[PDB]
Write a protein that binds this ligand. Structure first.
Ligand SMILES: *C(=O)CCCCCCCCCCCCCCC
Lengths: 158, 210, 141, 152
């Protein structure tokens, strides 16, 4: 159980919201910070799980949901809504991982926007350009928390 | 098993080569796979289902064998696949086949690779690469005093490769001692060489897979 | 015996170079040896990919000459652990992964003051590495 | 959440806010790492409420046994004190400094990575009815000592 991370994250958010007058900017810095974590975290992940490069957005989704989320958050999100092209899917979480307890509550702020940066940063380090975006948040009335994962392109070897 | 044989010049030129050896699915629009044009060939850039793998090339559409990056019908494959009115469409994929030129390149590429491996050697009196290993194949190389290379590709488990190389050397020797002033950059077309090499391969094919 | 060790980036950047038993030194500056080594390594990756009669999983594993053996390990993030030894040393893939996991990730990736994509400066990483390699059963000559 | 998540998060937190100070003071002088320490304090304030005493000592034994084990999966190496309210908590292998070095290679930056933790201890003391000042000091990584001063 990690209330440390959750509480620490809560302090970060709280702080930034005071630092910036507009929430849209907090979303930008959280995603960037996430990205900086993601490009580093991918290495920790690969060295611990021993998974190889992927070549299919479906196997990539399984690793993400069943191996990565489990290892760092002790949870296994559900994979749903595959676009016909197969270049799009969603991560469905029972609740919101980065959240502890919050005060309640119209806000442009994407509380757990850090996650998105982590996902895009990590995947980029493995030759995949993807967009991670929050389309459903339990913190905003929604039944569940949903992250949309969209594959943009495969990065080529230099 | 033995996959192929390559006989390279001291200059990196190929003077002899021999090989010793397909999924079809129906698709709707849009495709589940990402395709890209690469060296006059359409390959799978991303996505892997029902037999199809990344490096696979389009071999045929609707049962019609494709012509490089074009359709048997003359139209550009990727353009045809970009039109939703052409679906459903049947497509066949498989590991592309090496072109003669590609074989020439790879032989030249190996030439420099061989030398570097020798140059970058931490120990003195070192030869070039004698064995290169992969999960699907093993490459065995023997270099003659005159700089000729006999390269054999085979299953990682295939044995009795030393004798094969040594045998090819003999066979080659007969061609050299019979054609003393033959051009070095010219291909070995002698039918006895081809025929004898063939037989050595049959023998080696029985040395077991230990 | 363990001759030397190279660590490469996904862009050819020589993250690290260590040397123990090398009786034959390239006739060139190390800045150049790194480019040469990488170029060769990169050609092998391309070569192996087209030469193989079947689709691969791991790709290039190693090669050997008359005097030494080159061990090659590549992570899905492009990190390459290359080690040269005597012909005696078997696979040792666990060792190459250890260098990446227990030494590079742990003392480089986990060190925010350690920029990625450049020669590692961390004295710790360098100490730990050297100590680890000198431990390997096949280290001595 | 696994240990590395906090570790990496913390790292991005010091990187981005170690020089930030919206409430400077006389002549615009910023309090070194004030923001980081501020966040550690709030986090520590909550840990003080959520973790499992008679005298002051008991409160500090708690930080070394429960708080440290909960945050760094390890008890404090040593606990010292002049019987005047000033305590010295030392860790010979502080987790946030372990990956960095075993000597002096990164002392210049080391301090930036302690502000948060000091706040952690101060926030924990607060929740338990103890106002104080916690400072951090590193002579050579990874051996650092945290000083807790309880005013009279
Ligand atoms: C195939 O190419 C392998 C795919 C590996 C994907 C790894 C994704 C790791 C990102 C971490 C996600 C967990 C959330 C962490 C909470 C902040």
């Amino acid at each position: 159980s990690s209330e440390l991370f959750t509480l620490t994250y809560g302090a970060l958010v709280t702080q930034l919201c005071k630092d910036y007058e507009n929430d849209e900017d907090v979303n930008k810095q959280l995603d960037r910070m996430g990205y900086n974590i993601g490009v580093r975290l991918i290495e920790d992940f690969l060295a611990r799980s021993n998974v190889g490069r992927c070549h299919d957005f479906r196997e990539t989704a399984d690793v993400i949901a069943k191996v990565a989320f489990k290892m760092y958050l002790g949870i296994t999100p559900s994979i749903t809504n595959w676009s016909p092209a197969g270049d799009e899917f969603s991560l469905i979480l029972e609740n919101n991982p980065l959240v502890d307890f919050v005060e309640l509550p119209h806000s442009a702020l994407i509380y757990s926007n850090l996650l998105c940066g982590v996902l895009r940063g990590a995947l980029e380090m493995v030759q995949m350009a993807v967009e991670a975006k929050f389309v459903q948040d339990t913190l905003k009335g929604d039944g569940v928390t949903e992250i949309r994962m969209r594959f943009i392109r495969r990065i080529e070897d230099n | 098993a033995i996959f192929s044989v390559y006989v390279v010049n001291k200059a990196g030129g190929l003077i002899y080569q021999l090989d010793s050896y397909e999924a079809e699915k129906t698709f709707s629009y849009p495709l589940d796979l990402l395709l890209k044009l690469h060296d006059e060939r359409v390959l799978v850039a991303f996505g892997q289902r029902d037999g199809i793998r990344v490096g696979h090339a389009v071999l045929a559409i609707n049962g019609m064998d494709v012509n490089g990056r074009y359709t048997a019908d003359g139209k550009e494959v990727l353009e045809y696949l970009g039109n939703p009115a052409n679906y459903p469409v049947s497509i066949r994929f498989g590991r592309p086949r090496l072109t003669s030129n590609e074989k020439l390149m790879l032989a030249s590429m190996f030439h420099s690779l061989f030398a570097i491996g020798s140059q970058l050697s931490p120990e003195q009196g070192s030869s070039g690469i004698e064995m290169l290993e992969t999960d699907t194949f093993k490459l065995h190389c023997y270099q003659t005093l005159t700089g000729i290379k006999f390269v054999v590709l085979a299953d990682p488990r295939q044995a009795g490769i030393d004798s094969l190389l040594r045998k090819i050397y003999e066979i080659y020797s007969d061609f050299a001692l019979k054609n003393p002033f033959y051009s070095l950059e010219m291909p070995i077309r002698c039918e006895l060489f081809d025929q004898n090499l063939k037989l050595a391969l049959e023998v080696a094919e029985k040395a077991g897979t230990f | 015996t363990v001759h030397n060790l190279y660590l490469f980036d996904r862009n050819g950047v020589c993250l690290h170079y260590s040397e123990w038993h090398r009786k034959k030194q390239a006739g060139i500056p190390k800045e150049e040896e790194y480019k040469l080594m990488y170029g060769m390594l990169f050609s092998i990756r391309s070569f192996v990919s087209k030469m193989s009669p079947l689709d691969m999983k791991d790709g290039f594993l190693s090669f050997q000459t008359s005097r030494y053996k080159l061990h090659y390990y590549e992570t899905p993030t492009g990190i390459k652990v290359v080690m040269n030894t005597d012909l005696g040393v078997g696979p040792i893939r666990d060792v190459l992964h250890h260098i990446y996991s227990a030494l590079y990730v742990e003392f480089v990736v986990k060190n925010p003051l350690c920029p990625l994509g450049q020669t590692v400066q961390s004295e710790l990483f360098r100490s730990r590495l050297d100590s680890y390699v000198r431990s390997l059963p096949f280290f001595s000559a | 959440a696994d240990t590395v998540l906090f570790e990496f998060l913390h790292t991005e937190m010091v990187a981005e806010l170690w020089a930030h100070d919206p409430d400077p003071g006389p002549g615009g002088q910023k309090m070194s790492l004030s923001v980081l320490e501020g966040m550690g304090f709030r986090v520590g304030q909550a840990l003080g409420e959520r973790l499992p005493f008679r005298e002051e000592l008991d409160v500090l034994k708690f930080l070394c046994k429960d708080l440290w084990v909960a945050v760094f999966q390890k008890q404090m190496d040593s606990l010292r004190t002049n019987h005047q309210g000033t305590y010295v908590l030392q860790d010979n292998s502080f987790p946030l400094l372990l990956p960095m070095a075993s000597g002096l290679q990164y002392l210049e930056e080391a301090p930036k990575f302690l502000a948060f933790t000091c706040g952690l201890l101060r926030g924990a003391l607060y929740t338990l009815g103890i106002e104080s000042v916690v400072t951090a000091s590193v002579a050579a990584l990874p051996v650092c000592k945290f000083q807790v001063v309880i005013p009279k």
